[PDB]
Structure formats: C-alpha cells, structure tokens
Amino acid sequence: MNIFEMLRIDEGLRLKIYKDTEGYYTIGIGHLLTKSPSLNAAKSELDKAIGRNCNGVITKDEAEKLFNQDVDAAVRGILRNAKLKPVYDSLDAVRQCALINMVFQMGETGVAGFTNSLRMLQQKRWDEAAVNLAKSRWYNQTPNRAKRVITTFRTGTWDAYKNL
Numbered sequence: 001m002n003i004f005e006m007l008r009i010d011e012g013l014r015l016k017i018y019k020d021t022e023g024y025y026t027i028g029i030g031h032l033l034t035k036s037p038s039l040n041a042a043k044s045e046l047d048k049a050i051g052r053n054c055n056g057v058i059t060k061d062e063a064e065k066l067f068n069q070d071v072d073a074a075v076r077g078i079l080r081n082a083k084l085k086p087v088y089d090s091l092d093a094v095r096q097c098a099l100i101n102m103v104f105q106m107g108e109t110g111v112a113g114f115t116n117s118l119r120m121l122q123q124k125r126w127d128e129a130a131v132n133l134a135k136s137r138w139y140n141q142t143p144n145r146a147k148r149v150i151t152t153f154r155t156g157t158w159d160a161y162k163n164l
C-alpha cells in the first residue's frame with residue numbers, strides 16, 4: 001500500500017464536478033476546485049486547472065494528473081512548514097502517509113493546528129496521540145476516514161486499509 005492507493009480509497013474518484021463532504025465543488029480524486037457556492041466559478045477553475053474547456057467533466061487521465069500534482073503539493077507543503085517538517089522527518093514510512101493524508105484533506109494550515117497531537121507523534125506516544133487526534137471536529141465530521149488515519153498513526157501498519 002502507498003500514499004496514492006491510500007488516498008484513492010479515502011477520496012474515491014469522480015469524473016464530474018461534485019460537492020465534497022463540506023459542500024464544496026470538487027472533482028477527480030478529492031481535488032477541491034473552489035469554496036465558492038457558484039457552479040460557474042467552479043467550472044472556470046476546472047478549465048483553468050486542466051487547460052481546456054471541460055464543461056464540468058474530465059477524463060481519468062486528467063484526474064490522475066491532478067492527483068499527482070496534489071500529492072506532490074501536500075508533500076512539498078509539509079516540507080516547507082516549520083511545525084510539520086520535524087514531525088514528518090521523525091516518522092516511519094507508513095506513518096508519514098497518515099500525515100500526508102491529513103494535509104491533503106485539510107491543508108497544511110489546518111494540520112499545523114493539531115499542535116498537541118503533533119508533539120505526541122514526535123514523541124512516539126501513539127496511543128496518546130490517537131486519543132488527542134480524536135478530540136477534533138475532523139473526527140466528528142468524517143469519522144470513518146479519521147478512524148482509518150488515526151489507526152494508521154497508532155499502529156504503523158496498513159491494517160485499516162486492508163480488506164477495503
């Protein structure tokens with residue numbers, strides 16, 4: 001299992017513009033288009049992202065391209081962030097994916113806000129970090145996905161994504 005498979009499972013894949021769990025226009029593999037309520041704004045953002053008139057729909061290849069760009073961005077965002085870099089650097093390969101997963105979902109800014117959880121992860125206090133991570137709007141809003149990510153941080157294994 002790797003970051004791409006992991007996120008593909010958590011985000012799904014849709015070739016038509018859709019609304020994410022928060023009601024924001026998104027497409028492909030969880031690629032956020034805009035927070036604006038205007039479907040036209042979203043279509044414009046899409047065309048701009050793809051480089052053609054899409055009229056709201058894209059190909060699988062195009063979704064995958066956005067996806068690669070998105071993962072690179074999340075990773076790069078983590079590496080540029082002073083609060084994040086140290087944690088990411090301290091983690092094993094599996095747990096790094098869990099951190100990437102969070103950033104892809106909520107942005108580096110959001111993640112950098114889990115101050116207490118980050119310190120516990122840095123300290124390798126897995127059970128403690130797990131409980132702290134659960135005391136969040138994130139967990140309460142998208143519980144099944146948060147559970148998967150949290151288990152991953154707790155165990156350092158892919159068990160939560162096995163049999164999905």
Ligand SMILES: [Cl-]
Pocket residue numbers: 134135136137
């Ligand atoms: Cl809470």
Ligand SMILES: [Cl-]
Pocket residue numbers: 141142143144145146
């Ligand atoms: Cl969920």
